[PDB]
Design a protein around this motif. Structure first.
Motif, mmCIF file in Angstrom:
data_model
loop_
_atom_site.group_PDB
_atom_site.id
_atom_site.type_symbol
_atom_site.label_atom_id
_atom_site.label_comp_id
_atom_site.label_asym_id
_atom_site.label_seq_id
_atom_site.Cartn_x
_atom_site.Cartn_y
_atom_site.Cartn_z
ATOM 1 N N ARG A 7 34.917 33.402 39.716
ATOM 2 C CA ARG A 7 35.611 33.280 38.441
ATOM 3 C C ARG A 7 37.081 33.246 38.750
ATOM 4 O O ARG A 7 37.556 34.086 39.497
ATOM 5 N N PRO A 10 43.368 32.743 34.527
ATOM 6 C CA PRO A 10 44.594 31.984 34.284
ATOM 7 C C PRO A 10 45.837 32.744 34.716
ATOM 8 O O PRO A 10 45.857 33.982 34.721
ATOM 9 N N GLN A 89 40.215 40.737 44.958
ATOM 10 C CA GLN A 89 41.457 41.465 45.003
ATOM 11 C C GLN A 89 41.794 42.113 43.676
ATOM 12 O O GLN A 89 41.265 41.732 42.607
ATOM 13 N N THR A 90 42.670 43.106 43.755
ATOM 14 C CA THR A 90 43.149 43.787 42.585
ATOM 15 C C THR A 90 44.067 42.934 41.748
ATOM 16 O O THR A 90 45.037 42.346 42.257
ATOM 17 N N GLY A 91 43.793 42.939 40.448
ATOM 18 C CA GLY A 91 44.589 42.236 39.465
ATOM 19 C C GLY A 91 44.110 40.847 39.168
ATOM 20 O O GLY A 91 44.819 40.098 38.505
ATOM 21 N N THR A 92 42.922 40.504 39.642
ATOM 22 C CA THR A 92 42.349 39.170 39.477
ATOM 23 C C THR A 92 41.246 39.105 38.436
ATOM 24 O O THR A 92 40.827 38.010 38.048
ATOM 25 N N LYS A 94 38.241 41.778 38.112
ATOM 26 C CA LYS A 94 36.929 42.406 38.296
ATOM 27 C C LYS A 94 36.516 43.184 37.045
ATOM 28 O O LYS A 94 35.398 43.070 36.584
ATOM 29 N N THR A 95 37.436 43.985 36.517
ATOM 30 C CA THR A 95 37.221 44.808 35.333
ATOM 31 C C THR A 95 37.140 44.046 34.010
ATOM 32 O O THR A 95 36.315 44.370 33.148
ATOM 33 N N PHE A 96 37.960 43.009 33.858
ATOM 34 C CA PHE A 96 37.902 42.204 32.655
ATOM 35 C C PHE A 96 36.490 41.606 32.570
ATOM 36 O O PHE A 96 35.894 41.496 31.498
ATOM 37 N N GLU A 101 37.889 43.661 27.477
ATOM 38 C CA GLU A 101 38.918 44.436 26.790
ATOM 39 C C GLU A 101 38.684 44.376 25.299
ATOM 40 O O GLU A 101 37.703 43.777 24.832
#
Ligand SMILES: CC(=O)C1=NN2c3cc(F)ccc3OC[C@H]2[C@@]1(CCCN1CCN(C(C)=O)CC1)c1ccccc1
Ligand SMILES: Nc1ncnc2c1ncn2[C@@H]1O[C@H](COP(=O)(O)OP(=O)(O)O)[C@@H](O)[C@H]1O
Ligand SMILES: [Mg+2]
Length: 330
Positions: A7, A10, A89-92, A94-96, A101
């Motif tokens: 995934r 943007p 990586q962090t901020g790409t 994974k959590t979204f 949200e």
């Protein structure tokens, strides 16, 4: 056998106004992602990979759910075990992807937010599905997180995040683990979900004041268990148990994360067909060892950024995700 999707998110408003250049192009029709490792958009060297499915920046949550989760939920409802990982990586994202949200200004309720991610869409669907059909079923949930090779329960409202659980081998079924103290919460009805998650979202907050970069460096395991005592018109009472683990991994960027290190190493041993796999070398791999070469059905969703500053992390991810395509299980 193990399905891998990529995934791509943007450009963030930080890279929006900064008017930068995408070095990543995702072709959904070709199931292919291509990264520009060179220079000039006039003449460039590139790196290209093929996956089971790729989703570009314009992909919505519902799109992901419909395409990858829905089929996994169906298998789970049949009595099977499935696992979903979010790697990258962090901020790409994974959590979204696994949680999603909330859309702003209290615009929607929890069940209709276009921003909701896997975990909440799934819990809602479960009820929306079994409730219709003539089934006696029950849902249990657990959130087990690994920070520094220590085990935490983010759902138990009775105990605080400063109390680590213990893990022992399961004398009965081999290659299984027993987590002493993990609370399994029963979700009695859909309109009982959101609070269960609000508590989780709350407890993770304190977990963050207690441990450094917690949200980056921890692995969370969201597990939902379905006990169905189905009875179709015939009056056939099938007793099905389905289990789904939703895993949001620590950030793949590079103290040391023993589980992340052990995951990649485990993957290697499986693709390189080596006889010894280091499941036991970390808590994560021992917990989810059945998802890795075992009888569980597993999917990986790697997450990348279009940004050129991330080049190295993107190829590291694309590559790691690519080789996993070769793990065979079930
Ligand atoms: C209570 C709540 O709003 C939510 N809780 N979540 C949640 C908690 C959990 F233990 C396990 C899975 C989860 O999965 C879902 C998210 C989320 C929302 C995540 C909100 N975040 C925490 C607060 N945030 C900040 C930056 O304050 C942003 C991220 C959600 C829930 C239902 C529908 C849409 C979204
Ligand atoms: N596909 C996407 N579309 C829009 N915003 C996204 C997307 N993926 C991630 N984001 C956002 O980028 C940020 C990082 O997301 P996050 O889920 O925290 O990733 P990670 O967990 O890998 O650090 C958040 O601001 C989230 O809004
Ligand atoms: Mg995160």
């Amino acid at each position: 056998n193990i399905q891998v999707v990529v995934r791509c998110r943007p450009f963030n408003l930080a890279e929006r106004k900064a008017s930068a250049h995408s070095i990543v192009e995702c072709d959904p029709v070709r199931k292919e992602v291509s990264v520009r490792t060179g220079g000039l958009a006039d003449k460039s060297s590139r790196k290209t990979y093929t996956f089971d499915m790729v989703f570009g920046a314009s992909t919505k949550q519902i799109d992901v759910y419909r395409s990858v989760v829905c089929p996994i939920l169906d298998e789970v409802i049949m009595g099977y075990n499935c696992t979903i990982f979010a790697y990258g990586q962090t901020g790409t994202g994974k959590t979204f992807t696994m949680e999603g949200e909330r859309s702003p200004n209290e615009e929607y309720t929890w069940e209709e937010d276009p921003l909701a991610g896997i975990i909440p869409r799934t819990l809602h669907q479960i009820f929306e599905k079994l409730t219709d059909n003539g089934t006696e079923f029950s849902v249990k949930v657990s959130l087990l997180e690994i920070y520094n090779e220590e085990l935490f329960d983010l759902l138990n409202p009775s105990s605080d995040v400063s109390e680590r659980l213990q893990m022992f081998d399961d004398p009965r079924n081999k290659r299984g683990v027993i987590i002493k103290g993990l609370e399994e919460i029963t979700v009695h009805n859909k309109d009982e979900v959101y609070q269960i998650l609000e508590k989780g979202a709350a407890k993770r907050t304190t977990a963050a004041t207690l441990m450094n970069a917690y949200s980056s460096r921890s692995h969370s395991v969201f597990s939902v268990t379905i006990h169905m005592k189905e009875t179709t018109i015939d009056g056939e009472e099938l007793v099905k148990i389905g289990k789904l683990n939703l895993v949001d991994l620590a950030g793949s960027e590079n103290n040391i994360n023993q589980s992340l290190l052990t995951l990649g190493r485990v993957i290697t041993a499986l693709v390189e067909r080596t006889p010894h796999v280091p499941y036991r070398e970390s808590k994560l791999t021992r917990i989810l060892q059945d998802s890795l070469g075992g009888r569980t059905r597993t999917s990986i969703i790697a997450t990348i950024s279009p940004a050129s500053l991330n080049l190295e992390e993107t190829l590291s991810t694309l590559e790691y995700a690519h080789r996993a395509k070769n793990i065979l299980n079930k």
